[PDB]
Amino acid sequence: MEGFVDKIDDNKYLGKWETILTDGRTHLPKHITFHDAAAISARWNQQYVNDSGPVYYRHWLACQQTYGAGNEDCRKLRWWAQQITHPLHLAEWDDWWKDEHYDLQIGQHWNRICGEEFEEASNLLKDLKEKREGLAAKFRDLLKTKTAEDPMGKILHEVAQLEEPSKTPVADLVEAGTLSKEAVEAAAALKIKELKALRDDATWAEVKGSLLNGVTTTCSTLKKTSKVVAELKAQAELERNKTSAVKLDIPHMRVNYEKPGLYEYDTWFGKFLPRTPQFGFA
Amino acid sequence: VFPSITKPLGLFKNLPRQHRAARDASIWLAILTAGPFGIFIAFKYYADWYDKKLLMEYYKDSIVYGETYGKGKYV
Amino acid sequence: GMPNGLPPVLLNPFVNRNYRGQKRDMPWGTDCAFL
Amino acid sequence: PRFPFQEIPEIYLPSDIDRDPNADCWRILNQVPRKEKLLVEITDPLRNFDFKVAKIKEN
Amino acid sequence: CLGTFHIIRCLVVNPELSLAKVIPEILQPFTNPNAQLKAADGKDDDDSQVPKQWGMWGRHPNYGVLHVPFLDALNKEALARGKDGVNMGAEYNLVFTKSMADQVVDLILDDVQKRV
Amino acid sequence: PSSMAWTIGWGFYAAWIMKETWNLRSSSVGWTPITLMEAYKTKERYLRSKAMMERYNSELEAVDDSNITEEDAKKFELEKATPSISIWEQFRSNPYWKEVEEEISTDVRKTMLEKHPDYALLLEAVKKSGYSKLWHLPGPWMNEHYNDGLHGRFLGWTPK
Amino acid sequence: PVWVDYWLKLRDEKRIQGALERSILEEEPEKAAEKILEWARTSAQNKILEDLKLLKPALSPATIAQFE
Amino acid sequence: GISSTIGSVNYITTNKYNRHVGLTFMNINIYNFSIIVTSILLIGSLPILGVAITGLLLDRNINSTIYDVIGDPVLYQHLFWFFGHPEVYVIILPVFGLTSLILTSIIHKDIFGREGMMYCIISIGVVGYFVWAHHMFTVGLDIDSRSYFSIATSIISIPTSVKMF
Amino acid sequence: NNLPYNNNIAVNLLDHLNHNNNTDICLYIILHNLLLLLYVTLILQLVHRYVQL
Amino acid sequence: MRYGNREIESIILFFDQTIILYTSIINALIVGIIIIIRKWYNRKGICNQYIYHIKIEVIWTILPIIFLIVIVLHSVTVIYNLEINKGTNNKYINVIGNQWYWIYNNIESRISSLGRIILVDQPLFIKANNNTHLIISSLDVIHSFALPTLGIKVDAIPGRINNISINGLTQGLYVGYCSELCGSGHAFMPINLIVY
Amino acid sequence: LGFYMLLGLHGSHVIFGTIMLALLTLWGAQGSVGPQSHALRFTSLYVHLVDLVFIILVLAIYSANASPELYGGIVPNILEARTFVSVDAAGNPQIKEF
């Protein structure tokens, strides 16, 4: 990870770096047992594993319908559900999910709503999604055009579309003539001005005073809400063994940086993933 | 051969000889049924004991399994 | 004079209204239950 | 015998595979008359092969 | 006898076979059909907290080259580089998440760049 | 066993039959309030969901594709891709959609008590002592011919 | 080892943020806000310095010395 | 299946009550005993095969889903093979009986351990009802069941060796 | 089992007892039929013994 | 000559032990039968009384039993040795058996014309010494993923997701079959695995 | 098809038993059925068998259908999934079900 740039969010760039980094010549563990895989196998320890797919898929569904497919936890759950599920059931369930069957508000999975009403609501929701996606695509294209006018934005855009990943991207661009030393110097100058502004107490104090009310409100809300979260969590914990059923633990498994499992090792903490809608990608 | 176990043990001495012999045959069948059962149960429990020993000696100083396999609690 | 308050079962979801495109021609001749 | 991956157009290959034509991973170990067996199968008399098998730690 | 014992053991030990909907309600409260899904609080993070119903060699170490737990390997690696070893008890940052931190950084970066 | 043992066994079997019959009828009667409350809750949720989706669609229509200002790009958060978000969460995070969610909730609650006047009664039972205190709640639901105004809907995946 | 280094970096960041969370929960909101703002200051300085790090190969040896 | 069930019931009944005076149940010659045990085998298993075939017919005709992608083809295999192995021993045992009888007729000597052979025949008959799933070791059976069925198959192997000796 | 619906507690008031009950089974009518067959069995046994004696 | 896995080696050794036992028994019975027949055909050694011997019968019933418990124990341990490597994996592969072709991670594999019946256009690749989990099923009817030279043979049954653990030690191409009647093109539905 | 095949086989056996009982009624009317009649014995045994099978079927029905919760009314009290913690306009937190 020398020439890699985290900020860039281009799918082609991330794909090239995925091919470079997740290559099996260096990234494949030898004689390593991952506790996540061991536990998942130990819970369902027979050859008949029809029962794991539904459970993990439903965990991911709860995560997604409550927090959205963009949450890293829900991405982790989706990765696991894909791994431990056979693509036939997975294809069927994805087809059902597209039709808003699993939606937490008007889906038939979570609600006792008749077919006609469900169809009306599902069509309305899909129309809403279509319109918002159109608007978001236009806005993203505009931002792409606009970000190319900034000095540093120009450099990032040029690097994001280089034909191959390079140990030294800027040097290989400039020696190839695509990036101009004048633009590089201008971007460096802007960054230097901003950096110097951060260091000194005058501009800092200006910024720190301009941003204190929102931070204070967030701190107050977090300190107040944490208690109620614990109260409701305890009340739910009472429901743990009330009946023979199972209580979900939304989210089932979160991204763990202190104890990294197989997901964090394979996908670099969610950096190298398939680019599909089920992973919250456009 | 299968001698009459109930004669040297003084069991079922209030029945005719033929019925006593039937009881002896049933007892002998019971004895022969429980041989292989005993062998296989003993082997299984030895295997479990050896598994516990191996886990306690391999994960003795581990960080993850240093208290379950290390102590043999839930081998 | 009291009703039956049992919750009805859930048999067929809407997204599975076609039954996976499975042939259902009963021997009588029409795709209907004998009843 | 070797798998002809160069005669198949548009065949998926792993990024971490050795594409040299004469690599070890392209050999066909079984289901072909060989005269030089690379796999020990259940029908192979090692005595007929003079027990020229690899060690245990290796393999 | 072997057949009878095998059937009884299956009905007693197997996790997926539950005599819940197969016996009159008067006897039902003696059954816990979902126990396998509720073991270890339901969390799939620590084998040996999850029952494994095998006749033998349930937890037998593998052959070939004995596998090293990933977190043990990371503990050794981290201590080799001078950083702290694996915590094994640390919890998640439920409050003040990575997204909130990134948003704060974003706003101050926007202000500093704007009023450079 | 003697015939007396078999008579005792028949007595136990008869007792089991009687207990099953009583439990069956008691359960059939006792779940009416809870099923009614569930039906009303899902009805209200469906109406509120439709109202919020219609509001969101109307607001989106008003945005001109020729030029999107910051406010719109801030109202709909058009920076996070649609498949990367939960629309229903946007009614629990963004203040504007939070206010409209509250207003639509009040409107739907006002409307429901009109078409389902008895709903308020259940509200008293659930509010005071929780869902558990409806197992044998007496009220206007103890009538086989009593019409709850649902037209056989919002009770199952098919009309009742 | 590359993934090892990446993990150590991310873990350090999480531990700092977790200490900030503990402060948020336990101490006064004003103190928490000041802690958050100073942490953001240092993190953004790191981000901008990392951005400048990319341009080092193709920058003049003089200017490169004024911030390194 | 119907024909076999009728024949089996008839053979058992005739052999149990119509023996002439002075002939006990276990003194009837070897062939009759093997036919009796074969008949007992056929009686106990054919109804299960009938259930399996009715399942197939219902799936084909009324378009149910007992043995479909949402069904249990393994359930079909279990039922069929529960019938399957008893059929095999039904086939083999009468050959043992006939060979024993003919041997008595052509070697001009009695069967060595006639009681032993009769008991071994009934043992083979009984043990054949507990081994049906050794024809499904790759279906995906539980590991414990695989071990159990290997054990039971060896058990059935023993008395046949006694008979050969 | 894999089910089209939800059968986890604490998401709805009537979901935990969904997979565990097939309500449409004609319960008390089946009870009446069982009573009829018990009548038949006991009457027939009594009469059979009576004629035999 | 390498073995290509450890499970195959264990199975082979168990097979050899059973072969030795059965060959010994066959030789003993062959000697006995040779003596009996040689005496018989020359009209020697006749005794109509010799129709019972309690000791001999009891011993010949006991002997097969003691020599069989060993075989049973060895077989059970071999089964569990096959099944232990589950849970120590880091790669998952899913396999679908279509009607006369296979699918690996949504990539189709059909027979080719370069090889007669053994070779395939798209193989399935796994890494050497790296434990992998195969999740196998089928779409239309029952097939059987069969690579018996690595000790894998698991049925792909519709609606039933089987899960086997595969491990490779020798680099090369292993050829396998459908090993289950599936239709007309059952004989032309081969399997190719490449351990690299 | 499972529950229905069970009940349909039972119904078929009930029909055949009805035929047998009708024949036995006819013969009893004519006075041809004595106290030691094997027709009487067969009808008695068959009737007892079918009734016993129905007893077991009723037990199975009330096993699958029933549940102690159905008899006990064990409902939750929280609805965790559809319950979110939010801060109202006033500033103090609140709990409501979405």
Ligand SMILES: CCCCCCCCCCCCCCCCCC(=O)OC[C@H](COP(=O)(O)OCCN)OC(=O)CCCCCCCCCCCCCCCCC
């Ligand atoms: C419900 C009814 C249906 C049935 C279902 C239930 C089934 C239950 C199972 C019954 C059958 C049991 C079979 C025998 C169990 C195996 C015993 C065992 O675990 O042996 C351990 C032995 C060595 O262990 P290992 O891990 O290889 O150690 C290497 C370095 N120490 O392992 C090995 O060497 C590999 C295996 C070889 C074959 C086993 C032969 C016995 C082992 C010899 C004894 C152990 C030797 C240890 C040294 C000290 C002994 C004094």
Ligand SMILES: CCCCCCCCCCCCCCCCCC(=O)OC[C@H](COP(=O)(O)OCCN)OC(=O)CCCCCCCCCCCCCCCCC
């Ligand atoms: C005289 C003795 C019997 C002789 C049998 C001769 C035929 C042998 C074939 C065996 C099985 C045939 C299966 C075909 C019948 C299909 C029945 C059917 O359509 O079932 C649906 C019906 C319930 O319909 P449902 O949707 O619940 O109703 C909605 C509102 N009530 O559910 C039912 O109607 C279920 C009926 C019971 C299940 C079938 C078991 C056999 C009983 C015979 C029934 C009639 C057979 C008709 C066959 C015609 C050709 C002869």
Ligand SMILES: CCCCCCCC/C=C/CCCCCCCC(=O)OC[C@H](O)COP(=O)(O)OC[C@H](N)C(=O)O
């Ligand atoms: C003359 C007669 C000879 C016939 C037999 C010899 C022929 C060859 C056949 C030999 C073997 C015959 C069959 C006998 C072998 C059967 C072995 C068997 O049930 O294990 C028992 C099982 O492991 C242990 O069960 P346990 O009670 O611990 O309970 C379970 C606990 N929860 C567990 O899970 O931990």
Ligand SMILES: [Cu+2]
């Ligand atoms: Cu067989």
Ligand SMILES: [Cu+2]
């Ligand atoms: Cu095939």
Ligand SMILES: [Cu+2]
């Ligand atoms: Cu095939």
Ligand SMILES: [Mg+2]
């Ligand atoms: Mg097969």
